[PDB]
Design a protein around this ligand. Structure first.
Ligand SMILES: Nc1nc2c(ncn2[C@@H]2O[C@H](COP(=O)(O)OP(=O)(O)O)[C@@H](O)[C@H]2O)c(=O)[nH]1
Lengths: 430, 37
């Protein structure tokens, strides 16, 4: 009943999903053996969105774990909450991609992806009425960035009217992990802009900055980063699972946030986030939540929104609060920051209220914003890519198994066209 | 002539027989259900 399936790809995607499912199970009161031990009735009335019913009274997540090397999935199967997943849903290759977009999209993706399409079909149309798909992956890794986007293409072709959502991790050069990042990042962006309905960008640099500054903890870990990402993911779809004053689902959010068909790259942030020592020095109130929400540093991207203009903004509030206060705060912010809001879109913030807060918290907010500042990421990635591609560095590895330089030229042209089109509306006047 | 005194040596080269994982975050408050309606 308007449920959404989960497909995670690559090492990064598997690490994201292994924590997201733990967070969801904790929220819904599902034990690691799959037996419900909750405290109220509201925890089971919409449990069908993310889970399936099996014999014996246990629940199984409707997730599909696909990858090219079995090491990551063997690691996540032995961890806590690793017994929930159906062992059939594990699909793996034998050779891997080796951080090669060409290998992950042409030479092993074509051979393997048939089985994962079969399992995606089974899980998706075994449902009552599908709501959409959500994907977690990173654009810096070969197998993920290629096979996941080919999966996006085929799934979109087979389901043209469904909602497609992706949580993308964009590689930053300040903290770089792969010397071949620009190539596969550009190719993935080109293949994604044509198909994906919604895309969100996450940056490990911004995650490190948040963990060091706000939480004020000495040594962050990928567990902590995955925890922030999982909280952000659950915040978006909480309203689809719990009753609220103003209900709003993924399709509503997309319709209200996407002005033009090709502008679907958002950035997200979460609030409140306070350190342990100063956790109770603050007071949970709507003005404090909204100021920490609209704080530029709190955003999960290195793209500074103060360098551009917000096309639209979205705020999903969790808890019990007064709609008059929420609307007054939104109007006050939109009036006090008139410069950063493009003028031909009056009242350009959407608001929502959900009565069930995250566990352990009384008030929490999920923010999704589309601002003209993300073009800096595209410009920098294109600059690095063209610098590398001028001298034909690392080109033979990609061209040895099917591609030609014409597709790279087309990717550059499309990427620059996207940049120009997206910066066009920044200086537009009414 | 006397060659030397060191009687045997006879020894070659020989080699003798001889948790981050989890996360640290989150603050807890008592659960508050029962929506407004
Ligand atoms: N947020 C987050 N990012 C990760 C994690 N593990 C890896 N990454 C990022 O993923 C990138 C490498 O991805 P990769 O392992 O090559 O993906 P794959 O090729 O699909 O397996 C690196 O730049 C990391 O920053 C994680 O647990 N959390």
């Amino acid at each position: 009943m308007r449920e959404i399936v989960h497909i995670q790809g690559g090492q990064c995607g598997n690490q994201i999903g292994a924590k997201f499912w733990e967070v969801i199970s904790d929220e819904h009161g599902i034990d690691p053996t799959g037996t419900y031990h909750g405290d109220s009735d509201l925890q089971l009335e919409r449990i069908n969105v993310y889970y399936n019913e099996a014999t014996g009274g246990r629940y199984v997540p409707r997730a599909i774990l696909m990858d090219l090397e079995p090491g990551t999935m063997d690691s996540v199967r032995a961890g806590p909450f690793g017994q929930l997943f159906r062992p059939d849903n594990f699909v793996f290759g034998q050779t891997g991609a080796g951080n090669n977009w060409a290998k992950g999209h042409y030479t092993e993706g074509a051979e393997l992806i048939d089985s994962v399409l079969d399992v995606v079909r089974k899980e998706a149309e075994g449902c009552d009425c599908l709501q959409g798909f959500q994907i977690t992956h990173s654009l810096g890794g070969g197998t993920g960035s290629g096979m996941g986007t080919l999966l996006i293409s085929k799934v979109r072709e087979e389901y043209p009217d469904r909602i497609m959502e992706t949580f993308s991790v964009v590689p930053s050069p300040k903290v770089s992990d792969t010397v071949v990042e620009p190539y596969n990042a550009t190719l993935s962006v080109h293949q994604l802009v044509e198909n994906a309905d919604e895309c969100m960008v996450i940056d490990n640099e911004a995650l490190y900055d948040i963990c060091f500054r706000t939480l004020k903890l000495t040594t962050p870990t990928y567990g902590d980063l995955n925890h922030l990402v999982s909280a952000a993911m659950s915040g978006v779809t909480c309203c689809l699972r719990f009753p609220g004053q103003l209900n709003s689902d993924l399709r509503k959010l997309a319709v209200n946030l996407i002005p033009f068909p090709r502008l679907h790259f958002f950035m997200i942030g979460f609030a409140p986030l306070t350190s342990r020592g100063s956790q109770q020095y603050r007071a949970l109130t709507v003005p404090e939540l909204t100021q920490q929400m609209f704080d530029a540093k709190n955003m999960m991207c290195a793209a500074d929104p103060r360098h551009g203009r917000y096309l639209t903004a979205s705020a999903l509030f969790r808890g019990r609060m007064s709609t008059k206060e929420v609307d007054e705060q939104m109007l006050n912010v939109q009036n006090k920051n008139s410069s950063y809001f493009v003028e031909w879109i009056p009242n350009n913030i959407k608001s929502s209220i959900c009565d069930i807060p995250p566990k352990g918290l009384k008030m929490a907010v999920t923010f999704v914003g589309n601002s003209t500042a993300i073009q800096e990421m595209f410009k920098r990635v294109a600059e690095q890519f063209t610098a590398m591609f001028r001298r034909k560095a690392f080109l033979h590895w990609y061209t040895g198994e099917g591609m030609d330089e014409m597709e790279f030229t087309e990717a550059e042209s499309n990427m620059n066209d996207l940049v120009s089109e997206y910066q066009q509306y920044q200086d537009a006047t009414a | 002539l006397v060659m030397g005194n060191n009687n045997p040596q006879f020894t070659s080269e020989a080699m003798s027989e001889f948790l981050k994982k989890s996360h640290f975050k989150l603050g807890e408050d008592p659960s508050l259900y029962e929506t407004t309606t």
